[PDB]
Write a protein that binds this ligand. Structure first.
Ligand code: K
Ligand code: MG
Ligand code: MG
Ligand code: MG
Ligand code: MG
Ligand code: MG
Ligand code: MG
Ligand code: MG
Ligand code: MG
Ligand code: MG
Ligand code: NA
Ligand code: NA
Length: 86
RNA sequence: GGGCGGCCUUCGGGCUAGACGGUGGGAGAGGCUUCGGCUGGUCCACCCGUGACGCUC
């Protein structure tokens, strides 16, 4: 579920400025937030499988944004890859 | 890795129409499950955010 007391909390942390909600960093962060939030899920329910499909999709998406931000803005890439760790 | 890709530009750099994110909706014979839930995807809107971040073996 996550909720604002989570999804907004992350954004308010990775935002590049007071209203940022879609800046690659924010996009990656909250992307890494539900990736875990579901890695954990899959454990309790090892028979789900179907949900793993997205685990894979989310993971790919996260790596494609990161690669993008690694070309256009190296500095910011190391920054972001921290507070989360790649 | 490969192949093919938006607009403008005096090539320095701009920009949003794509994609993604935020928010708010919808449809559903998804899946797992102490049956109490946990969860994947999917389609819309806006005229919010990033700014081609894409599509393809
Ligand atoms: K499915
Ligand atoms: Mg696809
Ligand atoms: Mg440029
Ligand atoms: Mg999506
Ligand atoms: Mg709803
Ligand atoms: Mg049900
Ligand atoms: Mg759900
Ligand atoms: Mg917009
Ligand atoms: Mg730029
Ligand atoms: Mg291009
Ligand atoms: Na223009
Ligand atoms: Na193409």
């Amino acid at each position: 579920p996550i909720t604002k007391e989570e999804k907004q909390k992350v954004m308010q942390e990775f935002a590049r400025f007071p209203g940022d909600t879609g800046s690659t960093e924010v996009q990656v962060a909250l992307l890494t937030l539900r990736i875990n939030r579901l890695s954990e899920h899959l454990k309790v329910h090892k028979k789900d499988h179907h949900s793993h499909r997205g685990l894979l999709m989310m993971v790919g998406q996260r790596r494609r944004l990161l690669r993008y931000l690694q070309r256009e803005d190296p500095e910011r890439y190391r920054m972001l890859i921290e507070k989360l760790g790649i």
